[PDB]
């Protein structure tokens, strides 16, 4: 009599490819990263590089001025709550702790301060979020710090090597 077929479960990929990814490519089309007005069209590679670098510098200075005053970008009005609308934090959140404070100071003049705090509060530096951060930031200092951590603490050897 009345048949009941099973429903299809599609997320944000099937409908996207069925709607947007079902057209052709324009012939004389400039890259859509910029604008479309005739006076601001990229005529060569130099103009495109300059516009891209200007956009990157604008984004960087915007993020910098947002991180400088975090108390002006917190009153949300949206509902789905986009996770990419919250600035990152770089100041430590633990004072009386040792390993947790060192990790918060390293991950979240920062690496040296974290190393000094770990040496003062007697905190064993692990092989994750410590040696790699010291090698990426600072390379005789990183080697000296690794040697000091290996001489003062004997945990994992393969990861340290």
């Amino acid at each position: 009599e009345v048949v009941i077929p099973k429903k299809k479960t599609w997320d944000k990929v099937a409908v996207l490819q069925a709607l947007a990814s079902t057209v052709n490519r324009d012939t004389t089309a400039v890259p859509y990263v910029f604008q479309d007005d005739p006076y601001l069209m990229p005529a060569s590679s130099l103009e495109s590089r300059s516009f891209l670098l200007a956009k990157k510098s604008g984004e960087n200075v915007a993020k910098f001025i947002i991180n400088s005053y975090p108390k002006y970008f917190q009153k949300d009005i949206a509902e789905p709550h986009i996770p990419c609308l919250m600035p990152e934090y770089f100041e430590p959140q633990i004072k009386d702790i040792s390993e947790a404070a060192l990790k918060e100071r390293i991950e979240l003049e920062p690496s040296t301060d974290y190393h000094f705090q770990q040496t003062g509060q007697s905190e064993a530096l692990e092989e994750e979020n410590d040696e790699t951060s010291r090698r990426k930031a600072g390379t005789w200092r990183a080697k000296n710090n690794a040697e000091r951590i290996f001489s003062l603490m004997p945990e994992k050897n393969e990861h340290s090597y």
């Binding site: 009345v2 089309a29 479309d36 007005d37 069209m41 949206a78």
Partner: protein, 195 residues
């Protein structure tokens, strides 16, 4: 400093696809549109504005992205996510005899990032009582317990349910209320003899 670049009017061709130029609802950029359309109130002896710097063409939303061939291609590409309607539910009589329970929904829209709507919580349950197993005393007791929430002409039970922010909870609550109504109709209490 100062420079000059030719627009896309004399740069494109004639045998070119249209939706490939204006995919999304663009606010009409006088550049890739080779249509010198003039809109505005002119003067007695003069020429009105054309397309460049025209505020009327910028405020009014343009409908150049819904090309007929593009609409046909979009409707054809979405055939994979469709379900054919069964032939057993073509007439309304068979639909009412098979599925006599209707559940309405309230989904509106708001301008801005706000998604919550205080008027999107009502879900009226319309069930036709002409197909259920209702005798005489049970049906009379059900009508007495309902009161005015039952139509005496179309015979469609209309009960308004809105006691939670969600909708499936209200649906389950209405189903439970209907279940208790059907249970109490088959029961006789001590004060029913003194009717």
């Amino acid at each position: 400093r100062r420079k000059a670049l030719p627009p896309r009017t004399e740069k494109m061709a004639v045998d070119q696809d249209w939706p490939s130029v204006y995919p999304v609802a663009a606010p009409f950029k006088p550049s890739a549109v080779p249509l010198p359309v003039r809109m505005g109130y002119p003067v007695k002896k003069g020429v009105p504005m054309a397309k460049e710097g025209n505020l009327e063409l910028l405020k009014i939303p343009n409908f150049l992205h819904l090309t007929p061939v593009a609409i046909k291609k979009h409707c054809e590409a979405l055939k994979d996510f469709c379900t054919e309607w069964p032939a057993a539910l073509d007439s309304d009589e068979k639909c009412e005899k098979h599925f006599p329970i209707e559940i309405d929904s309230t989904d509106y829209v708001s301008s801005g990032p706000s998604v919550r709507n205080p008027r999107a919580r009502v879900v009226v349950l319309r069930v036709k009582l002409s197909s259920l197993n209702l005798d005489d005393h049970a049906k009379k007791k059900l009508i007495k317990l309902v009161g005015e929430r039952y139509c005496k002409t179309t015979d469609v039970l209309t009960i308004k349910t809105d006691r939670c922010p969600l909708r499936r909870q209200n649906y389950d609550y209405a189903v439970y209320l209907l279940t208790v109504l059907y249970h109490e109709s088959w029961n006789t209490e001590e004060w029913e003899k003194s009717k």
